[PDB]
Amino acid sequence: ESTFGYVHGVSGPVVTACDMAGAAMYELVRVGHSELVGEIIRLEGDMATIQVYEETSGVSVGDPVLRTGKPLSVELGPGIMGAIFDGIQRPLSDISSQTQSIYIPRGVNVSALSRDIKWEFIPSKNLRVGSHITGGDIYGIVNENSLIKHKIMLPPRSRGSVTYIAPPGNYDASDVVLELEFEGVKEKLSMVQVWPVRQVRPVTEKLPANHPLLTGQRVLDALFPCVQGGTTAIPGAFGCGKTVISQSLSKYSNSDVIIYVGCGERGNEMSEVLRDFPELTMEVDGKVESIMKRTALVANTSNMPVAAREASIYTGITLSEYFRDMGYHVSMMADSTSRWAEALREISGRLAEMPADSGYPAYLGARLASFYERAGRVKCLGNPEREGSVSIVGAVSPPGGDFSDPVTSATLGIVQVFWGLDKKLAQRKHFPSVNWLISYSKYMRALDEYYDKHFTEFVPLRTKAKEILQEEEDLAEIVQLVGKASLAETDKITLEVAKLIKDDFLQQNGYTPYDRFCPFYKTVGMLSNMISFYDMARRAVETTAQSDNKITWSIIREHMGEILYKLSSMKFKDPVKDGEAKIKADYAQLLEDMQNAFRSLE
Amino acid sequence: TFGYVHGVSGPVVTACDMAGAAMYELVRVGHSELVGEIIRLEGDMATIQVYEETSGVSVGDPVLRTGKPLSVELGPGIMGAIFDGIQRPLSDISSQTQSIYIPRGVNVSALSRDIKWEFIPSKNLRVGSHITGGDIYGIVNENSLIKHKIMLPPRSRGSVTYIAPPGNYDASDVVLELEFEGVKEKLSMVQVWPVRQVRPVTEKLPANHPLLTGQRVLDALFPCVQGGTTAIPGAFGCGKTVISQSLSKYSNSDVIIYVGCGERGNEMSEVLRDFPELTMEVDGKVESIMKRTALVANTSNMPVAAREASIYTGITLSEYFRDMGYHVSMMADSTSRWAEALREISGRLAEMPADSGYPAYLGARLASFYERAGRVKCLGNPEREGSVSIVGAVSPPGGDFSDPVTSATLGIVQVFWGLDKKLAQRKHFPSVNWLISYSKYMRALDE
């Protein structure tokens, strides 16, 4: 037998290779004299068909194809945080450092984690020679960053008795930091573990999801809440906001780490993240720190090789499952599942597989299903119990903006949260451009148990706000054929209040300091004021329309113009400058001003 | 020379011993010499899209190659001719066969042989004189109006070894002999040109002079330049003849070419009946307009490739007259019928559909045709200017301009005389809707 075959043929990202008798499907191969990374996709006898993760231009018939004996795999360990990786897990910082080039050179083999760095390691102290150990046992902590205590753990396949655990000190990926024996066979281990990306990292139990993922944005956290461990999509046409929402969730959320996958995205988004994320800061323990310390990127920009979009997604979720097994509340952004599915379309078209709808492969549903189901909150493997999570947010980009798109249709089949954006809102510069009719969040029944403990006022307010916006969209279908005049005064109040909710709550200008972030206490306070206005304005009409002394929407407006201005101004309150108590006290004063103004109409 | 038929399926004829054959070469199939184009090669075998109905073609039948792709015979004897879309001469087919039918597999030479034309050699030339493509080596008096400038073919060059003296010569007489690189070329009045190739130029000039129609709305408010690209929404209710007849009688173009793109049988016979009877005043004499035109007529049941080629034939004729320094006007009375013929070829080639079922290359096949218009400095040495103006009608169903042939045409033509049934019903002739219509040449005509 030979460890290497020979290229029989090439067509775009697909290569066919001879002398491959004894290859396996999804085995990694190196193709060409430059050792282009690729993965076997079909077998046809002593011949393989291969998908190449690097541009095949210049590959020749009779080029070597070295079989690796390994599936597509990521090195997990210290040196992930703040990194940017390409789609097949090569750190772009070390590629740049080693080669001084503005471009990624084809066939480069930069090791996935920087093995020259000496990391600080603390062994778990409980473990000692002769101790029992199993996959997922946290055998030590590496102080990778000021934020992330990197819980090193035994790989999920590994188990045994501890032969040796290293003392506290400085180490790298070549050091035998741990050694086991099992069934009489010794097993050397180091703080870097390999895992196959197409395989799910196992867990003790997948737990029910019951804590909100506070995003940066009013409309999201109020009307369509995500949960930690939740599966979410952001389908939207070009230029809607989907990247800005994915940025905003990454910049401003309670996720303990973020893995951000630039799958087929415009390249400036990666430069935006690398420009902004070292400068933008969170705070912990009274110390300010750069948000990059909790983030990692997997880039694979739109002009990078098509095939690598698959590897990029699977890399991002493999990382996310690893940080989940440490017990961190991971979030995973994916800048578009449709641009992933276009890689699946291209490979299918090269293989000549039969398409389903719009050219997409028939397994598209199963690929997306086995992606989003890698989310959840989990009781991690191994000895110490942890409640990790991955929350997955796939920013689907439907061709033509049309949600009948098979990727959108399959995505909305799987995800529990659907934030459908709308180009009509983005044309109006109504951002975030979430359409609040077509969107939904299936987690709300589970999250009601959280709101009832921490925000007992919220569930009524969420309900009334959704209803008011719905009633205005019902009224609009009539207004578009009769004009603004024929409506009853209660319905005028509904329409105007819904316009205030649309313009001064749903909209949020994330490139301005006051709307850059919006905490939940600000969000609920704005709702309490807008709904208190609605109930009192409606009540004032209903109390008096039984008489000639009838209050009306115009009487309210002309008596309360300053209160309407105060109501619209609430968005400008800024948590960077204003304390929580200061914003709350201003909003409490607005509630008192409304009550005394309405008492002055009675 | 010839190959043999290996298989037949509908119009597709596979032939063998075709090892010498070329892509889009023109082949005669069967004992009846049916026309077709090679659409594929696969070794010593060729697949021929036969144009005419293949019923009766047999395995082992001869398959005679012409040494040429689909091509137009150019020369004297074009004026007054009627051609099908592949340059077969419908008047002479009629007069030789004495039949109401085109016989399947006509081989009648397109320019009539045996007519000794009156030829005057270009009196400046001598044995040993240098010559280049587009040099006018003599003039043929084919009709009173159109002195036919015989010219060296664009790819031929060298030294004149012989030129025929003044006299009467038919299209097969060797009028010129020339030599280059020690190789002699014998040359005739007939000249063969590949129909899908642009006849080259010294330079395509910017168009700068009106193509006067003699019609107030058309000349005043929506002018077309000599060399201009234009369209008309040719449909029954709008009175399309008001433009085309006015152009034919009066307009300032020295020659005219008509392409019947794929018109209804009776509507085709209207063109062919009418034009012989139309007349022009020239130098105070009255003469039939057939002295200055050729009608490339095609009914809807002419072969698909003839309808698809017919547009390219008409412009390839028009470019020869342009190279004689004449201003041609070319009418194309339904680009939509040509686009249907193009769609049928694509369907028979089993190619994938694009917009509304048309092929992907519809945009390119339209654009690369309209770019064959314009003013030019001709090839060859007497520095003469000339032009082709292309007046290509469109037929959007229900008037809907979103129809891809119509939309792509309006994406290319610089002038659109938007005739309208509402004006024609009121007899507001010339029936041009001035709100719909436009011209982009206004700027260029300012000079």
């Binding site: 000549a352 039969m354 398409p355 | 089993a350 994938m352 559909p353």
Partner: peptide, 23 residues
């Protein structure tokens, strides 16, 4: 149309291969 065309091409390949297998 595209699915039916690709099916038709695979059938022609299978027919050609089936005739070659007679040699």
């Amino acid at each position: 149309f595209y699915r039916l065309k690709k099916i038709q091409e695979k059938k022609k390949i299978i027919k050609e291969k089936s005739e070659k297998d007679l040699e």
